[model samples]
Target: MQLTPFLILLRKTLEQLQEKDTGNIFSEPVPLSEVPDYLDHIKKPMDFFTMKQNLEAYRYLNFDDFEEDFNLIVSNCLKYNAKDTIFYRAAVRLREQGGAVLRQARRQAEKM
Candidate 1:
């Protein structure tokens, strides 16, 4: 089957998010051994790598579902780290930039 416009836009959006992640924190899942309490602090953890795998696996049913996972990455960080910390700051910045990309993707997808 042919790829849909929605998936194309979603893929591009995900790439932008990965690129914006300068700290590399959001690139992979939180290491449980190093961050043993991460799972306890945040029930639903997310990362860019998993999202990329899910995108390739065709797991995201729609844009909203993909967006939810994207937001989860930021929310997990915000919930786990203190606001004054670097990780928290990264999440805030990623959320701001990623949100802008998502909004732009939404608009373009709507037009398409």
Candidate 2:
């Protein structure tokens, strides 16, 4: 499948995000209270792909299997990083956004 459309969206989202002051991911973890606001500010189409990319990046860094990566991230966050709040919220938002994109991609593929 040509991922041009999805890649474009992802790139745009990353660009916009880079322009913002979301803070360094390597910093002392993001605050949970700020996640909703950050997610709310993301633009549409790009927002979906950006979320997916973020989720995937997180998985690539932390998980082993592609199938269980997302689940493992969520589970581990809820279990261990629950107190961190920011990272937790960000993860959840990414998962939700990624899910939207995944559905859209599936539909697009079906049409092809």
Candidate 3:
């Protein structure tokens, strides 16, 4: 059984977040406190698959998973040396791509 769908997200995040400078992860990650404000300020439509999926996935998520989501975004920033807005946007782009089977089955069911 799947340990947790978010694990996939975590792995992907950790992978992308690897810093190019030291080839090590960041000592600090993105701040969770300001994500909402950043997202709101961009004033752009969401387009990435992983980023949006993770946000929805975090809806019912616990403290640990929620924290990771924020970390992933910041890690992404550190990876590319992206600004807060760009990094957060990149975080939203991460696509776990696990729910597709269920989505497909639902679509098939709907077609019936």
Candidate 4:
């Protein structure tokens, strides 16, 4: 239930994913025409702003809203042609581990 390490890992993973360049998948400034393909891949429609909002929700440990947020992010990534096995795995892992880690981390922090 120790959360610091988990939180750190989650944060780092998310940062890497967001910052890493997928070469052909994403170009400078991401074009609008490609948005639909990306959404289709992720199975949802979302804009850049919504994606950022979802990431912020995850950062704040707002698990209750994660499903909606994550769905939006994933869907948008897919539509933008960013769909890859790695992205899918990372998203799943974050959701599966994030909440538990946050809760445990909060508890540990409280005892300090």
Candidate 5:
């Protein structure tokens, strides 16, 4: 059930990949919010500290504890208002694929 959107994206991305010669493949569900024309906030380059902190804070926490954590990571990026760093891009892509930390991403976004 949840796999439906991902399968669609995978198929679309794969076809897009075939049409193009180079660069990374990607997809999005929609324009999300007014963070940047790019990625997120910067406590550091790529702001991995915040990203890591959010990740670690939730590492032992359950997806049952996930809602704010999900918002945390998303907001962390937005707070930084960074360029298109892979960390932020990855997070968005994770959301696009399903959600960065909602449902299965919600479940796995913690323990996984």
Candidate 6:
């Protein structure tokens, strides 16, 4: 299961996303000191690095599991940062790119 095609696609998707990050906003964990109220505003926070760790740890049972975490990555940012902030903008962009990546991967999965 670890070497499944789905996991390969997911790993590629994550690599592509990390490369897409120009502002370095979602690449690493959110610092508590940088935004002291972050936990207070967002119930769940996720980042690309954590996702990579989870992937390697085989925490995702399937694509939907991966998607859920990806969604959290975007939603958490949007929820914590105002729409005018770069974080919000980055989240929005990630959501768009993520949707495309997931859809494409799903299509390929259906054939496999």
**Number of the top candidate by TM-score?**
1
> Each model's C-alpha lDDT?
0.89, 0.41, 0.39, 0.43, 0.38, 0.84
- Tens digits of lDDT, candidate 3, 1-112: 2255554454443333332213222334334474545444333322223434554554524335434444444444544445465443444343222133223333433343
Cα error, candidate 3, residue 64 (Å): 1.2
Tens digits of per-residue lDDT for model 4 on 27-73?
Answer: 22234484434433444454334444545455435333433443455
TM-score of each: 0.93, 0.34, 0.24, 0.31, 0.30, 0.90
Off by over 4 Å in 1: none
lDDT of 2 at 93: 60
Hey, what RMSD does candidate 6 come out at?
Answer: 1.5
Which portions of model 3 show Cα errors greater than 4 Å? 1-51, 55-60, 82-112
RMSD of candidates 1 onward, in order: 1.4, 11.3, 10.9, 8.2, 12.3, 1.5
* lDDT score for residue 29 of model 1: 96
Off by over 4 Å in 5: 1-64, 98-101, 104-112
Candidate 5 displacement at residue 83 in angstroms: 3.3
Q: Candidate 6's residue-wise lDDT over 37-105, tens digit each?
A: 888888888998999999999887777788888888888988888899888998899888878877877
Alpha-carbon shift of residue 78 in model 6 (angstroms): 0.8
Q: Specify the poorest-scoring 10-residue window by lDDT in model 5.
A: 21-30
lDDT of 5: 0.38
Query: lDDT of candidate 4?
Result: 0.43
How high is the lDDT of residue 33 in model 4? 83
Q: Pairs clashing in candidate 3?
A: 50-94, 50-95, 51-92
Better of 2 and 6 by lDDT: 6
Once model 2 is optimally superposed onto the true structure by TM-score, how far is the C-alpha of residue 102 displaced, in angstroms? Answer: 1.4
Error of model 4, residue 59, in angstroms = 15
**TM-score-superior candidate, 3 or 4:** 4
